[PDB]
Amino acid sequence: GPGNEVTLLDSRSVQGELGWIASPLEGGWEEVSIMDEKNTPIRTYQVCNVMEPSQNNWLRTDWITREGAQRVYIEIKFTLRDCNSLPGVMGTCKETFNLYYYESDNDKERFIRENQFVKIDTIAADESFTQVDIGDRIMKLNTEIRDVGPLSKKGFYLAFQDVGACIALVSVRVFYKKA
């Protein structure tokens, strides 16, 4: 449990805007706040350009220290709209997104090339869900976890690539397990 985990990043516990780096800067991944019962914002990132072709929208975290862990765990809570629930002809609509990482000793990288990112997985809605009670509503979200390693630079960046889905990333947590 949390007792044996050390959190490296938790998007839910960041104060103020996440300000993660989106490419394109506008019109792709955008920050959307969902207000919880205490009027604290849940900072989500969303993109839904299902009506436009050739989507390649990237979103990357800031630098995340690995603190001497070689194996980290990435937990994402998200929701997608199924293509069959979106009216309109959408020949290129997708229901997945891609997850990547890039290791670096440099905590202030800018414009990391697409080809520097290493793919972790294609993420889809699968069997596993969680419920997040926010007062007026209970968010029923897919929950997926992936391990990454072995890591060997001082830290890393995580990235999410959309290629034409209708996706909301509601929570991203990265942790390691401490012996």
């Binding site: 969902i34 993109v47 839904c48 350009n49 299902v50 509503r137 909301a168």
Partner: peptide, 12 residues
């Protein structure tokens, strides 16, 4: 787009 935005529920 965004064609839809997720708020509690999706709205499109």
């Amino acid at each position: 787009x965004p064609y839809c935005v997720y708020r509690x529920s999706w709205s499109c």
